[PDB]
RNA sequence: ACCGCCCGUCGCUACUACCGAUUGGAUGGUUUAGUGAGGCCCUCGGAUCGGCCCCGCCGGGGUGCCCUGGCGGAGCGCUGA
RNA sequence: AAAAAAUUAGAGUGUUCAAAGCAGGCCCGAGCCGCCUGGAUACCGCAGCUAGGAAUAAUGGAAUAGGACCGCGGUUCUAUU
RNA sequence: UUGGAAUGAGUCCACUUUAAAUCCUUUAACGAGGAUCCAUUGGAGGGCAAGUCUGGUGCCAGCAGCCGCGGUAAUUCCAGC
RNA sequence: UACCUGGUUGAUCCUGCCAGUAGCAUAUGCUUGUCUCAAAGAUUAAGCCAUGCAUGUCUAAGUACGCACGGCCGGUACAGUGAAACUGCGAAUGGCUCAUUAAAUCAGUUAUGGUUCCUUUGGUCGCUCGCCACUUGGAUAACUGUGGUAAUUCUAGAGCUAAUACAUGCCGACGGGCGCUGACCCCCUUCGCGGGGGGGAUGCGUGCAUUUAUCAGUGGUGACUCUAGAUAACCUCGGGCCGAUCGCACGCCCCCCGUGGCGGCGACGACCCAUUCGAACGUCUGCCCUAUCAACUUUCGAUGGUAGUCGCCGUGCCUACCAUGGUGACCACGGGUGACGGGGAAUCAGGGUUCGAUUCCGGAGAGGGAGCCUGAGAAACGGCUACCACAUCCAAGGAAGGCAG
């Protein structure tokens, strides 16, 4: 059973764990489960135990310490890019992308970068133009209809009054007798 | 239930479809759209059923996935779309241009209208309220908000719209004598002049309608919808012109036909 | 769950009362002379003709001027007509009334072989019919209950493939023809 | 859990009535937010359909409404002083609808010498401020003085409202729901139903 | 067909039901009282994970008149989850 | 007027007949965009709703007139003009 | 007493059927005399259609929805016809 | 086809039942060659279940740096394909069963002017005046490697990297208008002139939605305390909206040719309105047997009033205060039911009797209760949590369950 961090017990408890919790992945949306997890406190009962170092000392475990060994994946969004080559921004990021050789038996040596993510590309220069087209049309849109039915409704007014004010001038002739 | 349903039995079906009862156990349940899932026509039964274009509900999608079927001038994709009555249905592969009309029993028709007639569409005005900043606005049978519509225009007219720009030409008034035809209820799919209009204050207010040939009906305002002014209508008529005739003339008509053939 | 239909209905009705002299000799006339394998037969038919005498009955109660009276009162009798129990000059409801049994199951495939002449005995019309001997029209028919109606009586004949007539020999004589070409050599 | 349903009570007749089903979703109830006076605490609660509805557990500051002078001000909400449903409610100070609160005269008094330009909630001393005499007693030009004259014909205020003001204390009555909106709104008291609740609340101290 | 018919106790056999000490027994339902799992709500709580901030130093201008790229500090404060 | 379909009654239709099914039928010559169809109809109690009838049955109008109807004289109030 | 005609149940090419098959429909082969390719289940006093035949049992065994049959010539049991 | 026959007697006419007779649907006995259609673990045990399966899903169009394949290339950010995995949606339907349930469910009928509604379809989406925008911030899977446990669709540390995940946040439109406030200025009167009438600097505010108050009456209804307008404000950090999204055709302008501008067709998304699919709660009228059930309900809501709370709303739904009601021989209340309700089935002179677990609609339940998470929608069980009954695996520490598919 892992350990839990914030449980503060030398023993196991249940807990009820959701999305977000650790030792618990849910198997679908909003499902929780009570599972059994080990306190935060070190014991002797453990079978194994996970340490980080932080602090390096002058000697050198081997294996440890011997080698290192590299990120698998570079950078991926334009500016992750930017960031580890210290490039401001009237730089080129596509030439500054990390590319990884492929170097299996039989295939020949080629090589694979990814698609840089979050960048000004002619396509967003378009979207975001067509964007701002269509707030123009809109905009067209409701002055012609707003104008049209303000000639309209000052019609329909004019033809309402102009019989409304025919009748009661017929009214009041006849009211004369 | 715990939740909206997504299945319709097939006998359980609106029976002015057609289904029959041995080819499966399911209809197509009508996919949300403007019209209601009982006075609809989804486009499978259309397509499948009526005219023959396909045999199997598998190369109704392979035509709707060609985007070939056009409904109200939009390319409609969907194989359950509630096509609806008064609607236009176009195929520009072989021109057909249909439009749905009821025919004298009350089922849709294979109603075939010209290019220059698929143009439009007649819509009864389900509703006009003032929304926003003022500005008024027409709901319409089909459920098509029409913003800034004629002020003359009320509840119950049929108003005009062009399928391009979807914006009114012209309406009709609802008044008597103008020619309506009925689109629900026993009277279904008949065709008539309306000659009065009772009306019962928080009641079904009911309309009389006179017939081409004096056949004398009434059915609820819910039903009525004008297709014409006065007694010109707006439309084609369908096969039959909205006459109810009776079994026996039926007979008479059906013996005449099988007789003078042959 | 299933897209079947259960619609079925009975085509006969069994008698009242099980063992009454006077109907069982009538029934087995009518099976003797018609030639019906069973007492079913003769309550086939007296079921169809039982049902059709109670629907003239309401139509006769109905008046004239009864829409409902016309339509399915012509109806009725056209049917009558076509199968060819009631003569085409007896267009009137109270006639059916008068129709017996032995009216509609004249009308029946098997007695129209043997009438026709193609049968030389009502029991010779059934194994004729059954051995697929007969067409109506174009189609061989081995229903003996077949209701030949008017329009097709005139066009009952032997079938191609039949060996009476334009086929090929049936199988008993073609193994006495093979039994002769051995035996001559 | 809890449930507003209709089929746990009995019939009108008396007799009992057995459910036929469990206990619905849709027919939940929730705790009481029992809104108190303090600093601005609200809760969101997703509802059915998936709106929002805004539990406010304990609020501070209100929108009231000078209806006599259509003058709407943010004002801070004193305590409250008065509960028709249960003196238990006012006894530990729960905002609930149509409570009678005490609230800030301040804001709307200052909207009073900035329209009209008289001296409100001041006994006889009358301490003077430069501010306040910046703002009532200043050269504002012939045509905009003789504007503010006219206004002193109709400025006066019931004296029930003046007491208040000499206070700095506001009668005033929720009009909003605290537990579904989270906004303690409402109205100051004027008129009949201003000196109604003072009959009360006398009253209530003997 | 009066040498007819027929009633009840008693005795035998079978079957069914009843009364019956046993504070008889079993199961189902509802419910008072006591205890009360678990969820949810509220008042708290704060394992842990961040940011900013103040520096000392090459680091450059605020046009040191503090752009500030870095490391260690300790900010020993505030703030978020 | 509106009242689901299926079922039941019932129209048409050689599932070969039939229970069934809702299909099928004409025309071979061009299917030049094949044509020609059918997929009815009736019943849906009671209640509700709608418009007539007014016999039958119930009920009501003037008896301390607190009565119908017609105009007349006053004491008042309030919007629009 | 025969006689040779007919046929489908059957077996079985292909073909069709069908997602693939199946059955059905068609077809070629084969396939009927005791056409042993052999129809049963109930009953035969009445109600209720059909023996007062013959043998066996002898108020036994049984039958019998009801009335009743059976006590050595049973129209009713057990059997054959 | 509106129908009877045998049996009490020595015989008779009756009452009257038994028996016969016919259909129907369950079981069973015996027997059975062809063909079509076709019910089928309802009754008893809503009794228990081995095993397998019954719910998943990618387009040109959210995210591929898996060579797992693979064009193109010393030369390119990303050809295409594509698992895994993140994201999105579905999993609330369907199927099954009839245990509960007797004004309940349900049916016709009516209502929401008393609500909630993913989606579709239409509308709406420069309407707001206010030093990254040529695009911002942290993450984190899959992956690589290091593990634990007798055992699970168990998970832990370490390292890496995406977005339509999760955040944060402009620009523009944008010139302004309008509301208020008002330094000030002019004019007209000039009994002296008060007064009277116009411009106007600065300052505050301002769209839609939200919450409250006030005002005046564009369209609507039988009827709004409707819709729209105006004024004073408010607006939740557990935070309404005001696109930092994606594919495809690739054009056009360019004077001040800039890798400057500008543009077409889609997708995806969006508060809100209308709509569709509904759902929920109500109205009126209708249910079997039983008095060896006659009074019942009301502490601890019963029936009303008032103010709240809660809820999606109307409402004793709940609380506080108050009234003392409400239902009943026209059968209340209580009990029973081999009671889910209806469409319908059998039988048929007319009237009627009986059946309806069962394929269509409505409801209800998922071994029994209860409580919940997510979600538009569940009090969901091929979701979860607890208890009860039953039951499985174990190394005895634990783990796991639900065929009325
Ligand atoms: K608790
Ligand atoms: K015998
Ligand atoms: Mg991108
Ligand atoms: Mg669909
Ligand atoms: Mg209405
Ligand atoms: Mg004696
Ligand atoms: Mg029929
Ligand atoms: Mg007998
Ligand atoms: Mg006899
Ligand atoms: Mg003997
Ligand atoms: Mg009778
Ligand atoms: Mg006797
Ligand atoms: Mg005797
Ligand atoms: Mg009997
Ligand atoms: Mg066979
Ligand atoms: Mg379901
Ligand atoms: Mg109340
Ligand atoms: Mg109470
Ligand atoms: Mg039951
Ligand atoms: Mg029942
Ligand atoms: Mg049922
Ligand atoms: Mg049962
Ligand atoms: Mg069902
Ligand atoms: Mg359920
Ligand atoms: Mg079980
Ligand atoms: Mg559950
Ligand atoms: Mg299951
Ligand atoms: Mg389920
Ligand atoms: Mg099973």
Redesign the interface.
């Known amino acids: 059973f892992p350990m839990k961090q914030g449980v503060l017990t030398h023993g196991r408890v249940r807990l009820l764990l959701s999305k977000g919790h650790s030792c618990y992945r849910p198997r679908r949306t909003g499902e929780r489960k009570r599972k059994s997890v080990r306190g935060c406190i070190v014991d002797a009962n453990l079978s194994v135990l996970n340490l980080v170092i932080v602090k390096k000392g002058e000697k050198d475990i081997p294996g440890l310490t011997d080698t290192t060994v590299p990120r698998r994946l570079g950078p991926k969004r334009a500016s992750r890019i930017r960031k580890l080559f210290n490039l401001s921004k009237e730089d080129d990021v596509r030439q500054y992308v990390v590319r990884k050789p492929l170097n299996k038996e039989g295939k020949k040596p080629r090589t694979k970068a990814p698609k840089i993510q979050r960048l000004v590309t002619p396509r967003v220069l378009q979207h975001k133009r067509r964007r701002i087209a269509l707030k123009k049309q809109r905009t067209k849109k409701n002055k012609e209809?707003?104008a049209?039915?303000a000639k309209?409704?000052a019609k329909?007014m004019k033809e309402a009054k102009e019989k409304r004010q025919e009748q009661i001038a017929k009214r009041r002739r006849l009211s004369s007798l | 239930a715990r939740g909206p349903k997504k299945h319709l039995k097939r006998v359980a079906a609106p029976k002015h479809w057609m289904l029959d009862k041995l080819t499966g156990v399911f209809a197509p349940r009508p996919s949300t759209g403007p019209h209601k899932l009982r006075e609809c026509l989804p486009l499978i039964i259309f397509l499948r059923n009526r005219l023959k274009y396909a045999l199997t509900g598998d190369e109704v999608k392979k035509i709707c996935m060609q985007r070939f079927i056009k409904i109200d001038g939009k390319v409609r994709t969907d194989i359950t779309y509630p096509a609806g009555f008064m609607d236009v249905i176009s195929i520009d592969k072989t021109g057909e241009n249909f439009r749905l009309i009821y025919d004298t029993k009350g089922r849709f028709a294979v109603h075939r209208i010209t290019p220059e007639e698929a143009k439009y569409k007649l819509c009864k005005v389900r509703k006009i309220f003032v929304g926003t900043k003022g500005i008024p606005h027409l709901v319409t049978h089909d459920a098509r908000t029409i913003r800034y519509p004629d002020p003359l225009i009320k509840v119950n007219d049929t108003i005009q719209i062009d399928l391009e720009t979807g914006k009114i030409t012209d309406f009709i008034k609802f008044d008597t004598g103008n020619l309506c035809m009925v689109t629900g209820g026993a009277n279904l799919g008949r065709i008539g002049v309306i000659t009065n209009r009772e009306r019962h204050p928080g009641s079904f207010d009911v309309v009389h309608v006179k017939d081409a040939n004096g056949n004398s009906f009434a059915t609820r305002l819910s039903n009525i919808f004008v297709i014409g002014k006065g007694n010109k209508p707006w439309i084609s008529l369908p096969r039959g012109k909205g006459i109810r005739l009776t079994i026996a003339e039926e007979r008479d008509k059906r013996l005449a036909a099988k007789q003078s053939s042959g | 769950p299933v897209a079947r239909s259960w619609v079925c209905r009975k085509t006969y009705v069994t008698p009242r009362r099980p063992f009454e002299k006077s109907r069982l000799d009538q029934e087995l006339k009518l099976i003797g002379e018609y030639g019906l394998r069973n007492k079913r037969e003769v309550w086939r038919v007296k079921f169809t003709l039982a049902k059709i005498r109670k629907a003239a009955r309401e139509l006769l109660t109905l008046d004239e001027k009864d829409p409902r009276r016309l339509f399915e009162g012509n109806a009725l009798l056209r049917r009558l007509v076509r199968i060819g129990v009631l003569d085409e000059g007896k267009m009137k409801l109270d006639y059916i009334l008068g129709l017996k049994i032995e009216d509609f199951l004249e009308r029946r495939l098997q007695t129209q072989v043997f009438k026709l002449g193609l049968a030389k005995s009502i029991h010779h019309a059934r194994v004729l019919i059954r051995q697929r001997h007969i067409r109506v029209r174009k189609q061989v028919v081995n229903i003996p209950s077949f209701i030949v109606r008017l329009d097709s009586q005139k066009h009952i004949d032997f079938s191609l493939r039949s060996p009476y007539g334009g086929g090929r020999p049936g199988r008993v004589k073609r193994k006495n023809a093979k039994k002769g070409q051995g035996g001559a050599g | 859990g809890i449930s507003r349903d209709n089929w746990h009570k009995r019939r009108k007749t008396g007799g009992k009535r057995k459910p036929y089903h469990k206990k619905r979703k849709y027919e939940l109830g929730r705790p009481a937010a029992n809104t108190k006076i303090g600093p601005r605490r609200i809760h969101t609660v997703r509802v059915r359909g998936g709106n929002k509805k805004y539990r406010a557990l304990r609020l501070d500051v209100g929108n009231f409404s000078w209806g006599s002078e259509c003058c709407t001000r943010k004002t801070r909400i004193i305590d409250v002083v008065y509960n028709a449903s249960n003196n238990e409610l006012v006894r530990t100070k729960t905002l609930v609808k149509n409570c009678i609160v005490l609230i800030d005269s301040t804001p709307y008094r200052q909207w009073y010498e900035s329209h009209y330009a008289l001296p409100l909630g001041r006994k006889k001393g009358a301490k003077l401020t430069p501010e306040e005499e910046e703002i009532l007693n200043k050269k504002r030009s012939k045509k905009i003085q003789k504007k503010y004259d006219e206004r002193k014909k109709n400025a006066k205020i019931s004296s029930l409202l003046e007491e208040q003001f000499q206070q700095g204390k506001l009668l005033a009555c929720i009009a909003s729901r605290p537990g579904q909106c989270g906004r303690a709104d409402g109205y100051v008291l004027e008129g009949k139903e201003l000196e109604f609740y003072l009959r009360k609340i006398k009253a209530r101290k003997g």
């Open positions: 209809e707003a049209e039915y309209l409704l329909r």
